[PDB]
RNA sequence: AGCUUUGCGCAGUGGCAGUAUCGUAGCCAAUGAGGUCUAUCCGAGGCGCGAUUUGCUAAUUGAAAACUUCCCAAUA
């Protein structure tokens, strides 16, 4: 062979840059494959949870 | 006029809630249900059947857990 040690690193990230849990990554993949995203209520709940997490991690 | 009682309903605090809270259309019941104490005495329901409204919020699962056209590229 040519001779090298390829650093094959595979990670799941989002548009916000945060690393995603495997369940979250699978949910994103399924939402993109099915062509339909989550509903308005689910999106609002996720946004509120993200805001709460950001507030908690700030202190 | 001030004050107070019983009963009742509204409102409120606090408390209880499966030996608790009710329906009972079934039956019996002050013309006496049920009594081991106090029995020539007490005085209320008892026994079977069948139950334990509404709103909000959160979380989990799932691709989607339900409110009215969405997406892609570029400039402003």
Swiss-Prot record:
Sequence position, cross-link Glycyl lysine isopeptide (Lys-Gly) (interchain with G-Cter in SUMO2): 9, 23, 49, 58
Organism of this sequence: Homo sapiens (Human)
PTMs per UniProt: Sumoylated with SUMO2.
Shown segment, full-protein numbering: 701 to 759 of 800
Annotated protein name in UniProt: U4/U6.U5 tri-snRNP-associated protein 1
Subunit note: Identified in the spliceosome C complex. Component of the U4/U6-U5 tri-snRNP complex composed of the U4, U6 and U5 snRNAs and at least PRPF3, PRPF4, PRPF6, PRPF8, PRPF31, SNRNP200, TXNL4A, SNRNP40, DDX23, CD2BP2, PPIH, SNU13, EFTUD2, SART1 and USP39. Interacts with UBL5. Interacts with IVNS1ABP (via Kelch repeats).
Lineage of producing organism: Eukaryota, Metazoa, Chordata, Craniata, Vertebrata
Localization, UniProt: Nucleus
Function, as annotated: Plays a role in mRNA splicing as a component of the U4/U6-U5 tri-snRNP, one of the building blocks of the spliceosome. May also bind to DNA.
Reported tissue expression: Ubiquitously expressed.
Similarity comment: Belongs to the SNU66/SART1 family.
